[PDB]
Design a protein around this ligand. Structure first.
Ligand SMILES: CCCCCCCCCCCCC/C=C/[C@@H](O)[C@H](CO)NC(=O)CCCCCCCCCCCCCCCCCCCCCCC
Lengths: 48, 470, 156
């Protein structure tokens, strides 16, 4: 039974409710859209 | 990494188990006799078991007091017990043995006629040392002239010199790295390096001694897994290696280590304690012997105790690293400056080595330190001993493997007027007990010839010729 | 008179206490000490092989239990008592479970008890004891019995 088992590391100790608060504060999101330029804003003709 | 005869790996464990068994038995009859001022004991019962049950049995192979300069020949004082071997006391009788356990490689720990006259003159003009630190009143002129000789010698732009070679590693590593960093050290690193890493908050891993294919596999995992619990990025990575790994006698594989540290953008911390006056055609260390550009390593630590015959340490690097350390290193701010006659004797030794003393005996030392080591090491291998290290190293440990051969190989040699050094279990791994032989440039050929026949005759009795002779 | 050279590799393990148990030659000595005690018992007092195996299995109980599962800490002061709440069994392999060297140490008290029973014709005078000893040994070495005590006796 034993001579066939697999070596495993002992389970880890889960994160605390205080540590998570820090990680949620260091994280920073990128801007929603890339910054605009001047070649990026040409208007098309308006016809009748 | 060490070839061990199988039949000797078995009579060593048996020898240690017998000591363990008799020690536990004897300590069990002391705990029941203590029946015959309220504070807790200075030391528990069982934290110094191998200090009182293994070290006290052979305590006469250590701490031998000498009464002469650390030269090729010195005088060893004799000690008796007088109370059944509990407290050794020194007599007036002396001996005259062959020095093979010191460290003066270039033969500077003596009275030579270019350095001692200058140091004595720099004494009676400066009185030992200043009582202030270096940022207040302890920066004499000699302290400013010496930090130029070291920069010229080592090769890097700037250098700082301290007053202890052990504080040069515990008071600096905290500055460069902190919490969130990583330190992939080598297995066989000095105690100062590990204590310095502990004094900060950094994490320490260990890669296999002197093999880079294992250094790569550790960096890959550690950069692919981040911090151990909250998988942030590693803020830094520093790799610490040594020039010559003493007590193994091997030169490091520096070109194959720097190349892998560049790839993963890790830093390199060199440690030229044993290899700063010994190896190299000019004495510039491993970075000259192995032909590696000195600007690929970020920090280079050294020590003047072994080659230059004077206490101290140094760190060399980019001109902003030195400016940062001179402003935020506790050892530089709070500690008394290195004494003045102990700095003049480094200046006047680097002048001899570089050949700026007028004479030319700065190359005779560098050649005779090599033609002696290559002879001694070659002769020991031909007789069948097991000696480690390469061909270009002043140290050559001889393996013994048996705890009982440590007091047998040393007591005989001392009786035949040869002094050596032996290292036991609590300091080393269990299976690897050895003797360390240090060869200097002040030994003559007549001395090595005479000392080899004393060793060859002692090695028959103990039977430490594990390899076959011819 | 010397052959069979082996090129031992240094496993890091960074712990003087439990790194010597990886070099070549440990298992052979482990067994040769047991086979040496067996012969020395039935020489100082002539007896039956079965009893002598029983005395070997009983002496191997106290020595192994007191060393691997009772004592806590290390006898080296260099690590500033970092392992004060752990026993020699728990320090092994940095807490890694079911390794090559743990299974060998688990397998010995069983096979040694089989020999001390199969040559003593079971009975009850010795069977009762040997069973208690091997049971204590095997329970103490269970993976689930990691850093857990019994009623807080020698636990903190
Ligand atoms: C006469 C031949 C032997 C007689 C009896 C010898 C038994 C002694 C072996 C006990 C091994 C102890 C393992 C861990 C002990 C720890 O608790 C203490 C403190 O923490 N660590 C230390 O003192 C330092 C750690 C390493 C020191 C071990 C030195 C002994 C080396 C021998 C190990 C390999 C040979 C034996 C393998 C295991 C022996 C198992 C006991 C066999 C039972 C014998 C009774 C018949």
């Amino acid at each position: 039974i034993l001579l066939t088992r697999k070596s495993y590391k002992p389970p880890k100790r889960p994160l605390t409710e205080q540590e998570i608060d820090e990680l949620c504060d260091e994280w920073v999101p990128e801007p929603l859209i890339p910054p605009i330029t001047e070649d990026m804003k040409h208007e098309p003709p308006v016809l009748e | 990494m060490i070839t061990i005869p199988y039949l000797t790996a078995v009579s060593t464990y048996f020898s240690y188990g017998l000591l363990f068994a008799f020690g536990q038995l004897r300590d069990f009859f002391r705990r029941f006799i203590d029946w015959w001022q309220g504070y807790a004991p200075i030391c528990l019962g069982h934290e110094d078991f191998y200090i009182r049950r293994l070290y006290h049995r052979i305590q006469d192979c250590f701490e031998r007091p000498i009464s002469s300069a650390p030269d090729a020949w010195f005088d060893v004082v004799e000690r008796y017990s007088n109370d059944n071997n509990k407290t050794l006391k020194r007599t007036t009788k002396t001996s005259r043995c062959l020095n093979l356990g010191s460290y003066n490689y270039l033969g500077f720990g003596s009275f030579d006629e270019y350095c001692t006259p200058r140091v004595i003159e720099s004494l009676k003009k400066f009185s030992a040392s200043t009582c202030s630190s270096r940022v207040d009143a302890g920066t004499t002129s000699v302290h400013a002239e010496l930090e130029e000789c070291v920069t010229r010698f080592v090769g890097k732009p700037a250098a700082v010199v301290f007053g202890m070679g052990y504080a040069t590693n515990s008071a600096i590593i905290p500055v460069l790295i902190g919490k969130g960093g990583l330190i992939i050290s080598d297995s066989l690193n000095h105690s100062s390096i590990v204590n310095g890493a502990r004094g900060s908050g950094a994490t320490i891993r260990v890669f296999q001694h002197n093999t880079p294919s294992h250094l790569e596999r550790v960096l890959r995992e550690q950069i692919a897994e981040g911090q151990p619990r909250t998988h942030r990025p590693w803020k830094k990575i520093i790799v610490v290696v040594e020039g010559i790994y003493s007590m193994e006698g091997e030169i490091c594989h520096l070109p194959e280590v720097v190349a892998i540290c560049k790839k993963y953008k890790a830093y390199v911390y060199l440690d030229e304690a044993h290899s700063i006056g010994a190896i190299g055609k000019t004495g510039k260390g491993i970075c000259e012997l192995l032909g590696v550009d000195t600007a690929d390593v970020d920090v280079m630590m050294g020590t003047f105790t072994k080659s230059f015959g004077s206490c101290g340490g140094y760190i060399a690097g980019s001109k902003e690293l030195i400016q940062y350390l001179k402003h935020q290193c506790p050892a530089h701010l709070y500690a008394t400056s290195i004494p003045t006659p102990s700095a003049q004797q480094i200046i006047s030794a680097i002048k001899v080595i570089l050949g700026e003393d007028g004479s030319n005996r700065g190359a005779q030392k560098l050649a005779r330190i090599r033609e002696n080591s290559n002879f001694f090491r070659a002769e020991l291998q031909k007789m069948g001993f097991e000696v480690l290290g390469d061909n270009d190293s002043p140290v050559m440990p001889i393996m013994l493997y048996n705890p009982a051969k440590i007091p047998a190989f040393s007591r005989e040699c001392l009786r035949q007027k040869v002094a050596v050094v032996v290292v036991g279990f609590p300091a080393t791994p269990l299976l690897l007990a050895r003797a360390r032989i240090c060869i200097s440039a002040s030994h003559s050929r007549e001395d090595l010839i005479r000392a080899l026949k004393v060793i060859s005759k002692v090695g028959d009795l103990s039977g430490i010729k594990y390899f076959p002779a011819e | 008179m010397a052959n069979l050279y082996v090129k031992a590799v240094p496993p890091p393990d960074m712990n003087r206490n439990t790194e010597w148990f990886m070099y070549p030659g440990v298992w052979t000595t482990y067994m040769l000490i047991l086979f040496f005690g067996w012969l020395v018992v039935l020489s100082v007092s002539g007896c039956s092989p079965g009893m002598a195996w029983t005395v070997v299995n009983l002496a191997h109980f106290v020595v192994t239990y007191h060393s691997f599962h009772w004592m806590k800490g290390t006898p080296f002061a260099d690590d500033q008592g970092i392992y004060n709440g752990l026993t020699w069994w728990e320090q092994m392999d940095n807490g890694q479970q079911l390794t090559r060297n743990r299974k060998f140490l688990t397998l010995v008290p069983v096979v040694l008890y089989l020999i001390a029973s199969h040559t003593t014709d079971y009975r009850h005078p010795w069977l009762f004891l040997n069973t208690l000893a091997v049971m204590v040994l095997v329970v103490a070495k269970f993976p689930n019995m990691h850093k857990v005590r019994i009623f807080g006796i020698n636990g903190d």
